[PDB]
């Protein structure tokens, strides 16, 4: 409704001020929060655009090796996407009290939403290529996101607003899951360092992703080809 500020346009344009304790500003700490999400979003859309995103325009169309930690990353991802959709909602109900349009409450987890979705599309296209250690962009993302959320958690501790705030319990749950993603990525570093047999099997449901094990996306190509032809033995 105003010019879009990122912060408090009101209070005679306060809270842009850094003056005393320089990392003590909440606008500074969500401005530090939004930088790894745009780093994955701006390193990952080039390599996924150039390596899987219609480089092979219709002519790629088979053996699927899974990296370790495979159920754990996707279940911990759905915990992250769940709690960060709660961050989008708890940001926008805190913004909607006063008509000033504070964009620090919802824009950084909107970038984290796009970063978590493109991180899982990065993991889904970095397995089944089996280039195994082009995951060094992804471990950089869990280090920088875990670092800036621990800075946000101890700066929430220094204002002593704790366990009454849904933003506090929200950010503490994000603090423990970002270190959980970092420890399963260093578990991927742990085995060896920087196969499954597949000879005309065609039933992929033991060895696919956890989401596409759960909602069966491999079978969609069979029901697409059933309209082409009656299927055989």
């Amino acid at each position: 409704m105003g010019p879009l500020a990122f912060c408090g346009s009101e209070n005679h344009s306060a809270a842009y001020r850094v003056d005393q304790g320089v990392l003590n500003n909440g606008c500074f700490v969500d401005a530090l929060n939004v930088v790894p999400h745009v780093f994955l979003l701006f390193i990952t859309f080039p390599i996924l655009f150039i390596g899987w995103g219609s480089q092979s325009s219709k002519v790629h169309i088979s053996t699927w090796l899974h990296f370790p930690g495979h159920n754990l990353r996707w279940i911990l991802t759905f915990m992250l996407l769940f709690v960060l959709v709660c961050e989008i909602a708890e940001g926008i109900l805190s913004d909607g009290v006063t008509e000033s349009h504070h964009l620090h409450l919802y824009m950084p987890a909107g970038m984290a939403f796009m970063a978590a979705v493109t991180s899982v599309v990065y993991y889904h296209n970095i397995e089944t290529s089996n280039f195994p250690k082009l995951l060094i962009a992804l471990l950089v993302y869990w280090t920088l996101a875990f670092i800036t959320k621990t800075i946000k958690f101890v700066k929430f501790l220094d204002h002593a607003i704790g366990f009454s705030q849904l933003r506090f319990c929200l950010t503490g749950l994000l603090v423990i899951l970002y270190g959980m993603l970092l420890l399963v990525e260093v578990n991927v570093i742990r085995v060896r360092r920087y196969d499954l047999q597949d000879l005309g099997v065609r039933f992929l449901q033991p060895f696919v992703n956890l989401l596409s094990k759960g909602t069966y996306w491999w079978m969609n190509a069979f029901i697409k080809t059933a309209h082409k032809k009656p299927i055989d033995l």
Partner: peptide, 16 residues
């Protein structure tokens, strides 16, 4: 293999 493919088609239909 044919009963498992009929199963995975029925599970596809029920999740959608």
């Amino acid at each position: 293999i044919a009963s498992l493919f009929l199963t995975a088609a029925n599970r596809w239909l029920e999740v959608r």
